[PDB]
Amino acid sequence: VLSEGEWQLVLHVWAKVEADVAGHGQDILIRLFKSHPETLEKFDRFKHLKTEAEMKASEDLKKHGVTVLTALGAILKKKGHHEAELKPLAQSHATKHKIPIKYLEFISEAIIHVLHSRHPGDFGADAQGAMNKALELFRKDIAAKYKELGYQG
């Protein structure tokens, strides 16, 4: 359970993300795909992209970055009371898109890296720990729905 102080740190940096959702979404998906190439293979939409330059030029990848960060932002602004928003996301990522929990750990590392790079004055170590905790809470609760459905592994 995050404290109110930890939520404030998370949502303070998140409001900075919201000034450039698309740019962040690009940088986070590119870092995920470069750091963990197995993740790119899960997207038939993107698996043609073979260089970072082709990634950065793809408008469809930039669109999907916005989709991902808009969904994450709506879950973070619920401060933990996010059951309605996670149900459908866990259901599609377990049963349709076939994404292991560990790749949600990987995209959480890429989100934390990109926020540190873009917002270092609002993303010191207090806020990095709080955002770590918020992304762990997201993973914990998606993993419980995976397990329900027979996909925790």
Ligand code: HEM
């Ligand atoms: C912060 C974590 C994530 C969030 C909030 C998120 C959110 C979303 C949303 C909102 C959609 C479209 C609606 C849906 O299908 O449920 C989607 C689609 C999808 N996601 Fe995620 N996602 C996340 C992580 C990942 C990861 C780590 C992968 C792959 C490694 C992944 C793979 C996919 C795929 C393959 C689609 C379908 C894309 C398409 O072909 O249009 N997701 N995601």
